[PDB]
Amino acid sequence: KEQGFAFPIGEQAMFEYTTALNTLLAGENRFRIGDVTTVCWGAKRTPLEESLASMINGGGKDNPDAHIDAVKALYKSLYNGQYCKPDGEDKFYLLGLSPNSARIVVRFWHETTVAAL
DNA sequence: AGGAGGGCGAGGGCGATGCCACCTACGGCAAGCTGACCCTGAAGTTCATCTGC
């Protein structure tokens, strides 16, 4: 394939995911686990039940950098002592990229919720 | 010569053998440095060698 074509990826996906990585590696989603800078973002949230979506105008918008604060605090409560047993049922993506020489080394990737994380 | 050498059963009966209070007092328990040395990358170009013309 000779570079690029080995992973046949379209522009409307390559550009999208590259911009996503560039935006999450420069805001509040960038946090280090153990000597490894890992970006986190919420997965496809639930459609939200009626009793909760009735008070939220919109209603519930599937925001990526929204419910990531739970896992962020957990990885921070490990260093802060404010850890508590969390009830999952809310999947949080965790792409554990790491720098080698100049290639994005993926160290952690778990689609499971914060409970299994 | 023939002797008999103790019969007897008591020998601890009573109770205390520690009274106190200590058994540590001080202050140090790191000081100084390292915790990485090099590479090897994405991506395009560039040179002398592989081959056909």
For chain A, the maximum distance between any two Cα atoms, rounded to a whole number of angstroms, is 55
Q: Which residues contact A16 (CB under 8 A, 6 or more apart)?
A: none
Experimentally, how was this structure solved? cryo-EM
Query: How far is it, in rounded angstroms, from Cα A26 to Cα A114?
Result: 23
Using alpha carbons, select from A74, A114, A73 the residue that is nearest to residue A94. Answer: A114
Contact A67, A42 (CB under 8 A): yes
Q: Say yes or no: Cβ of A1 under 7 A from any atom of strand B.
A: no
Q: Which residue has the tokens 């009626």?
A: A50
Resolution, in Å, please? Answer: 3.3
Residues 96-115 of A with CB under 7 A from strand B: 101-103
